[PDB]
DNA sequence: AAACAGGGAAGTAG
DNA sequence: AATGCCGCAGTCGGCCGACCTG
DNA sequence: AAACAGGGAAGTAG
DNA sequence: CAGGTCGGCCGACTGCGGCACTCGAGCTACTTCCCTGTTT
DNA sequence: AATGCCGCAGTCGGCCGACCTG
């Protein structure tokens, strides 16, 4: 029966349900038959698997990338630096873009936020030169290059690019500004000190306030590296699509998506 | 098409009027009007009433203007003065021409605030209390210029009022007469992707809507997914 | 208070939560304040609103569109005709594409399926010429042009394009075929008579079998044209994202998405 | 058609007034103010 | 540890208090490190600011430096501009608002730029009161001059490394040092005083014992506890550190 | 001398 | 080194207070 | 006569 | 031995993502290596 | 005239039959 199903799939490349109904076999057998076929396409529609790390304290981990605001003209090279924890964002509109402009943006961001402990970026040539790496090593700031052609590694800063572009569009339609610097400063002011969240906390006071939380809950945890539901473990932070469990034996907290977190009672 | 040219030679209506009357191209009507040497809530609710000065009529330079705020139906007559008697006759003929209005908004003219006017409106049961009427004045003088051999300024003004009310055309194909005796939504341009609006919603239902922007000759049908209210 | 909130939003274009927290107003008031702002962007992320009509009987409503299979060379202009009810699909690989090719494809599809009663397509110039319209009127087949630049109106045939392209890729990787016609015929054979659904029914026997169903359930129904939950009404057909209620007073069945259907007991 | 529309900018159920159209969960209510019609979500619409 | 403090002072020139609070150095050692360098000799925040325009000879063309000083927490912001015109003052106001936020009253001088209709209208639009302070009593002027002197001293200190590409970069570096590095005697940076988390101690803050060095390092904030283990979060650490309760000492 | 039949141009959808 | 997201907005639902009622 | 310093080319990421 | 328990299995369901007439050209920016003018 | 979808695949869960047990 199984050999007949394999031969039929090799001949026609049927569906799993077709084999299951025609050859009177279990659904799992038909699914594995269609999976083992070399000619069958790979499953592109993969569910949520990876989640980018975040800092559990303000000024720990930042992401950074550039964008293009063509309305600025020569100042289209907008630089964006985001704190992953509190979503505190800083932006500069600098003409051109090179090691000099990146260093200037880093200095102004440090003046605006403070010392970070790890800075993640994309794999752009500007963030690879020995000039910027030497500067970061001198200032004792770890740098993570990230996987090339993978914006999901800098998903946080990309979403902040969306927010910043929306705010700039809103304020540009609102009125007139002398220079792109003035408009960008107003947009940053709104986004940081005015654009309050749903818990009554501005981004500025999240980036610069005390860390407080209720007794963290205990949740069943699926370790993807071992494939077993092991727990319970303390859930440090959680949200939409991300979770941060901290097992007692673990050296560092583990970032897993929401699908792998199950409440425990 | 040929008859449209002589109709414009006679009345000098708009290109929309010509095209809706004669089934011609918008470009054809625009070319005709350009070539023309003389062409360079609910109704009866709220009115605006004003008098204008038109020196070309000589002794009859005082033309009182009354326009509906919804249908933009326009009525005007020329008299020797802007006195209380003249305003009273204007109110009588405005009633005769357009029916019963609910509220009338006027300027601070002494005749308009005259007691006889107050008891006039009190007996005809109408309460008493501005850019639209000014644009109406501009339209009236423009049509009077375009109409330039007539017998009397009354005859000329009758011609102008007839053209503006029953010939002159808006986009939706309904004259001032139909509007007097008969919703804005955001829409996303499905081709370019840029959001457009505000535009009037004609008809909608079951996953699609009909939107007719003032700058387009034909209505635009867009999927319901790209419709947002204006709510001014 | 409300005037102050309106002025503040006009000045900064804040968030609804910001106004709600700072000015001590209800959430609905802040939401409408941010909505009424002319400069605020329109809501692009609109939920599922429209659903394309489907036929309640085989051979009633069809959709049709062309695609591009570059592996065929001169025969890349593949034509696809789909019955909306049973998902019965027919395809032809014809060199070029014009009124002549469309008429030939229509004749072969009629030979393959039969007489349809309404044929929906896109707004391509080929389906607009008086030749094809005259042919359809002579054969007593209603034609619906559809909204331009709106593939969601032909979503069914587009998804069938996806399925057909996947099947052609599978069979091309499986072995060798003499002509694109042979490969397309094999793919159509598999998709129609072999690619069985999860209910043990091939597409061919769905397109050509008796219509049977259990006593249709009664469900609360939200009429979008009146905005009121009116019911109960008989639910003729339902699935993923589509529903077809038939009220007693309605002239024709109404197609509404799943979000507007509520079970009734 | 008379409906009860909630002026949720103040929270008062002003009315009655005519209803022009509907759709998208919104009812295009036209109050006595002939300046411009307004759209209100159908959750805040009560037929009279 | 002392050599790390020396490198930190060589990079950023701060006072001894910041070094001793960040690297656990003793008073005399930190002061001696500070002396070693060749060139080292209101009641509520965001309520009352103050502004003034000073001149610096080093910049040359951007000598006009506008400084915004919070009266309570001394959170200092500076900007280098080509002129003192109304447009430049307005841009500096917008950038200061971006840096700090919305104050209640912004005291200024009697310069025509501040008194100009544009600046006053802008301030009234944002619901920000403007106090001209036309009596030239040197109290606010004294404090703003003190801040100007601090900015000039920081610029002179940071001028050791002639690698600053633009005056904006150097000014940003100096502002960063003065705000987020230089600490007071009580152990709080300018940002901490300015943003007001120092009101009480609503969280359990517990002393911690380290195992790598075998020395009681802390005290630090407690995240959670259970099953004989405590999750303490060190200030300088990347991630929380699990610590047995045998090595945990409550701290008041 | 206005009209009829290619040919080209223009516009629109895919 | 080396990993999707989060704001806009519509919606569900439980809590608390004013109103109808046996 | 092999080596050092522009200049160009090539490769890679954005 | 009949009731509670655990394993196999299929119904129902949801995450997801490309179908849309098709694809490339280009610029900035950095590092690394070879050709060639210049050196000791 | 005029409107998203549905297959691939992982997953939840209840039903039925074999196994453990007081
Ligand atoms: Ca990048
Ligand atoms: Ca098509
Ligand atoms: Zn296969
Ligand atoms: Zn004319
Ligand atoms: Zn706004
Ligand atoms: Zn020093």
Distance A121 CA to ligand 1 centre (A): 7
**Which token pair is A259?**
């699908």
What is the SS3 assignment for E51?
Answer: strand
Taking CB atoms within 8 Å and a gap of at least 24, the contacts of B133-137 are B133/B48, B133/B49, B133/B50, B133/B65, B133/B67, B134/B50, B136/B48, B136/B65, B136/B67, B136/B72, B136/B74, B137/B50, B137/B52, B137/B65
**Which token pair is E7?**
């490198």
Of A15, A171, A190, the CB nearest to C195: A15
Q: For E4-30, what is the HEC assignment?
A: HHHHHHHHCCCCHHHHHHHHCCCHHHH
Query: At which of A179, A207, A235 does a domain end?
Result: A207
φ and ψ of B38, to 5 deg: -90, 5
Burial class, C257, CB count within 10 angstroms (exposed 0-12 / middle 13-18 / buried 19+): middle
CB atoms within 10 A of CB A243: 21
CATH number at residue D29: 2.30.30.10
* E9 found inside a domain: no
Give every CB contact of residue B135 below 8 A, 6+ residues apart in sequence. Answer: none
* C32 found inside a domain: no
- DSSP state at residue B164: I
Neighbours of ion ligand 5 (CB under 5 A): C 13, 37, 40
**Which token pair is E128?**
């920000």
Number of residue pairs across B and D with CB atoms under 8 Å? 35
Of A114, A179, A185, the CB nearest to E98: A185
Chain D positions in Cβ-Cβ contact with residue B184 (cut-off 8 Å) = 36-37
Euclidean distance between CA atoms E91 and A184, whole angstroms: 11
- For residue B193, the enclosing domain spans 184-229
Q: A146: Cβ under 7 Å from strand H?
A: yes
What is the SS3 assignment for A169?
Answer: helix
Euclidean distance between CA atoms B212 and B205, whole angstroms: 15
With touching defined as 3 or more inter-chain CB pairs under 8 Å, the answer for chains A and C is: yes
Q: How far is the CA of C96 from the C1' of F8 (A)?
A: 24
Is the CB of A15 less than 8 angstroms away from the CB of C41? no
Give every CB contact of residue E160 below 8 A, 6+ residues apart in sequence. Answer: E38, E39
Residues B173 and B111 in one domain: yes
Residue with tokens 């003190």, as numbered in its chain:
E146
Indicate which ligand has the atom closest to the C-alpha of E15.
6
Structural domain count of chain E: 2
Give every CB contact of residue C182 below 8 A, 6+ residues apart in sequence. Answer: none
CATH number at residue C127: 3.30.420.10
Residues C68 and C191 in one domain: yes
Q: What is the DSSP string of E170-204?
A: HHHHHHHHHHHT-B-SSS-BHHHHHH--BTB--S-
Distance E132 CA to ligand 6 centre (A): 38
Structural domain count of chain B: 2
Interface of B with C in 165-194 (CB under 8 A): 186, 188, 190-191
CB atoms within 10 A of CB B129: 9
Distance A39 CA to ligand 3 centre (A): 5
Q: How far is the CA of A121 from the C1' of H13 (A)?
A: 12
Q: Which technique was used to obtain these atomic coordinates?
A: cryo-EM
- DSSP state at residue A259: G
* E244 found inside a domain: yes
Instruction: Name residue D41's beta-bridge partners.
Output: D26
Indicate which ligand has the atom closest to the C-alpha of A67.
1
Residues C80 and C188 in one domain: yes
Euclidean distance between CA atoms D45 and D3, whole angstroms: 6
N-to-C CA span, chain B: 41
Euclidean distance between CA atoms B117 and B127, whole angstroms: 11
**Which token pair is B80?**
């020797």
- Do E149 and E123 touch, CB atoms closer than 8 A? no
- Do A164 and A68 touch, CB atoms closer than 8 A? no
User: Searching chain C, which residue's CA lies closest to the CA of residue B190?
Assistant: C149
Burial class, E6, CB count within 10 angstroms (exposed 0-12 / middle 13-18 / buried 19+): middle
Tally the C-alpha atoms within 13 A of residue A248's C-alpha that lie toward its C-beta: 14
Tally the C-alpha atoms within 13 A of residue A58's C-alpha that lie toward its C-beta: 18
* E1 found inside a domain: no
Number of residue pairs across A and C with CB atoms under 8 Å? 66
With touching defined as 3 or more inter-chain CB pairs under 8 Å, the answer for chains C and B is: yes
Residue with tokens 């209101």, as numbered in its chain:
E42
Residues B173 and B89 in one domain: yes
Residues C97 and C192 in one domain: yes
Taking CB atoms within 8 Å and a gap of at least 24, the contacts of B123-131 are B124/B95, B126/B100, B126/B101, B126/B102, B127/B102, B127/B103, B128/B103, B128/B104, B129/B103, B129/B104, B129/B105, B130/B48, B130/B50, B130/B105
Is the CB of C51 less than 8 angstroms away from the CB of B207? yes
Nearest to B86 by CA among B77, B98, B99, B75: B77
Distance C69 CA to ligand 2 centre (A): 14
* B20 found inside a domain: no
Cα angle A42-A47-A48, degrees, rounded to a multiple of 5: 135
Distances (CA, A) of E96 to E61, E79, E197: 21, 9, 21
Euclidean distance between CA atoms B200 and B108, whole angstroms: 35
Residue with tokens 């208090």, as numbered in its chain:
E17
Of C29, C225, C228, the CB nearest to D9: C29
Element (H, E) at A80: strand A78-83
Nucleotide nearest to A163 (CA to C1'): G7
- Do D6 and D24 touch, CB atoms closer than 8 A? no
Nearest to B75 by CA among B197, B12, B5, B165: B165
Euclidean distance between CA atoms C58 and C54, whole angstroms: 10
Is the CB of B221 less than 8 angstroms away from the CB of C152? no
Give every CB contact of residue C217 below 8 A, 6+ residues apart in sequence. Answer: C235, C263, C264
CB atoms within 10 A of CB E43: 7
Residues B69 and B114 in one domain: yes
Q: How many residues does chain E have?
A: 252
Residues E139 and E217 in one domain: no
Element (H, E) at A219: strand A218-223
Residues E156 and E233 in one domain: no
- For residue C254, the enclosing domain spans 218-263
- Do E244 and E227 touch, CB atoms closer than 8 A? no
Tally the C-alpha atoms within 13 A of residue A132's C-alpha that lie toward its C-beta: 23
CATH number at residue B224: 2.30.30.10
CB atoms within 10 A of CB B229: 23
Euclidean distance between CA atoms C4 and A9, whole angstroms: 70
Q: How many helices (H) and strands (E) does chain E have?
A: 9, 10
* A15 found inside a domain: no
Distances (CA, A) of B54 to B83, B140, B156, B164, C150: 16, 10, 13, 18, 55
* B10 found inside a domain: no
Euclidean distance between CA atoms E24 and E240, whole angstroms: 21
Euclidean distance between CA atoms B78 and E91, whole angstroms: 58
Residues A80 and A121 in one domain: yes
Residues E143 and E232 in one domain: no
Nearest to E169 by CA among C154, A94, A155: A94
CATH number at residue B158: 3.30.420.10
Residues C95 and C149 in one domain: yes
Residues B79 and B54 in one domain: yes
* A162 found inside a domain: yes
Query: At which of A160, A181, A207 does a domain end?
Result: A207
- Do B136 and B40 touch, CB atoms closer than 8 A? no
Residues C198 and C93 in one domain: yes
* Resolution reading in Å: 3.5
Residue with tokens 């509906």, as numbered in its chain:
B68
Of E95, E169, E195, the CB nearest to A107: E169
Of B45, B46, B204, the CB nearest to D23: B204
Is the CB of D45 less than 8 angstroms away from the CB of C2? no
CB atoms within 10 A of CB E57: 7
Element (H, E) at E149: helix E140-158
**Which token pair is A31?**
């699914």
Euclidean distance between CA atoms A26 and A17, whole angstroms: 10
Residues E183 and E74 in one domain: yes
Q: B218: Cβ under 7 Å from strand J?
A: no
Residues B75 and B154 in one domain: yes
- Do A212 and A237 touch, CB atoms closer than 8 A? no
Q: C34: Cβ under 7 Å from strand G?
A: yes
Euclidean distance between CA atoms E152 and E54, whole angstroms: 10
Give every CB contact of residue B207 below 8 A, 6+ residues apart in sequence. Answer: B223, B224, C49, C50, C51, C255
Residues B172 and B191 in one domain: no
Indicate which ligand has the atom closest to the C-alpha of A80.
1
Is the CB of D10 less than 8 angstroms away from the CB of C2? yes
Residues C84 and C168 in one domain: yes
Is the CB of B183 less than 8 angstroms away from the CB of D23? no
Q: How far is the CA of A159 from the C1' of G5 (A)?
A: 6
Nearest to E46 by CA among E109, E99, E115, E102: E102
Residues C163 and C199 in one domain: yes
For nucleic chain I, give residues with Cβ below 7 angstroms from it.
A 20, 26-28, 44-48, 96-99, 125-126, 128-131; C 65-68, 70, 122, 151-152, 155, 158-159, 161-162, 165, 198, 240
Q: What is the DSSP string of E214-252?
A: -S----EEEEEEETTEEEEE-SS-SS-EEEEGGGEE---
Nearest to E72 by CA among E195, E216, E154, E212: E195
Nearest to A233 by CA among A212, A214, A243, A248: A248
Distance C174 CA to ligand 6 centre (A): 75
* A20 found inside a domain: no
CB atoms within 10 A of CB C185: 15
Q: For chain C, what is the HEC assignment?
A: CHHHHHHHHHHHCCCHHHHHHHHCCCHHHHHHHHHHCCCCCCCCCCCCCCCCCCCCCCCCEEEEEECCCHHHHHHCCEEEEEECCCCCEEEEECCCCCHHHHHHHHHHHHHHCCCCCEEEECCCHHHCCHHHHHHHHHCCCEEECCCCCCHHHHHHHHHHHHHHHHHHHHHHHHCCCCCHHHHHHHHHHHHHHHCCCCCCCCHHHHHCCCCCCCCCCEEEEEECCCCEEEEEEEEEEECCCCEEEECCCCCCCEEECHHHEEECC
């Amino acid at each position: 029966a199984l050999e007949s199903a394999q031969e039929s799939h090799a001949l026609h490349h049927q569906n799993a349900a077709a084999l299951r109904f025609q050859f009177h076999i279990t659904r799992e057998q038909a699914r594995e038959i269609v999976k083992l076929c070399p000619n069958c396409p790979d499953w592109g529609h993969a569910p949520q698997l990876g989640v980018n790390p975040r800092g559990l304290k303000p000024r720990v981990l930042w992401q950074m990338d550039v964008t293009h605001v063509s309305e600025f003209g020569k100042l289209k090279y907008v630089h964006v630096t985001v704190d992953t924890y509190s979503h505190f964002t800083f932006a500069t509109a600098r003409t051109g873009e090179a090691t000099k402009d990146v260093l200037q943006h880093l200095a102004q961001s440090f003046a605006y936020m403070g010392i970070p402990q790890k800075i993640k970026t994309d794999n752009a040539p500007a963030y690879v030169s020995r000039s910027i790496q030497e500067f970061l090593a001198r200032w004792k700031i770890s740098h993570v290059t990230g996987i090339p052609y993978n914006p999901q590694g800098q998903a946080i800063v990309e979403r902040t690019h969306q927010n910043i572009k929306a705010q700039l569009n809103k304020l540009q339609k609102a009125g007139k500004y002398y220079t792109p610097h003035h408009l960008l400063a107003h947009a940053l002011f709104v986004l940081n000190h005015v654009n309050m969240d749903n818990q009554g906390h501005t981004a500025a006071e999240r980036h610069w306030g005390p860390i407080s939380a209720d007794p963290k809950p205990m949740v069943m945890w699926k370790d993807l590296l071992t494939g077993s539901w092991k727990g319970p473990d303390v859930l440090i932070t959680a949200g939409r699509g991300y979770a941060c469990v901290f097992p007692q034996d673990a050296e560092s907290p583990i970032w897993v998506p929401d699908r792998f977190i199950r409440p425990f009672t | 098409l040929e008859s449209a040219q002589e109709s414009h030679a006679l009345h000098h209506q708009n290109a929309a009027a010509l095209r809706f009357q004669f089934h011609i191209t918008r470009e054809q009507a625009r070319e005709i009007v350009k070539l023309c040497p003389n062409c360079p809530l609910k109704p009866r609710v709220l009115w605006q009433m004003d008098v204008t000065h038109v020196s070309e009529f000589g002794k009859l330079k005082y033309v009182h203007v009354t326009v509906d705020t919804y249908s933009h139906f326009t009525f005007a007559t020329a008299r020797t003065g802007e006195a209380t008697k003249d305003v009273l006759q204007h109110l009588a003929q405005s009633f005769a021409y357009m029916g019963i209005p609910q509220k009338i908004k006027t300027d601070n003219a002494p005749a308009y605030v005259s007691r006889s006017i107050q008891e006039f409106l009190a007996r005809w049961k109408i309460s008493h209390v501005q850019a639209i009427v000014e644009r109406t004045h501009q339209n009236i003088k423009a049509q009077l210029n375009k109409l330039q051999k007539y017998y009397t300024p009354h005859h000329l003004l009758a011609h102008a009022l007839f053209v503006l009310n029953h010939v002159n055309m808006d986009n939706q194909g309904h004259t001032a007469a139909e509007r007097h005796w008969g919703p804005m939504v955001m829409w996303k341009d499905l081709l370019t992707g840029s959001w457009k609006g505000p535009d009037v919603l004609i008809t909608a239902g079951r996953g699609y809507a009909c939107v007719f922007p003032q700058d387009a000759e034909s209505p635009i049908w867009v999927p319901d997914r790209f419709i947002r209210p204006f709510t001014e």
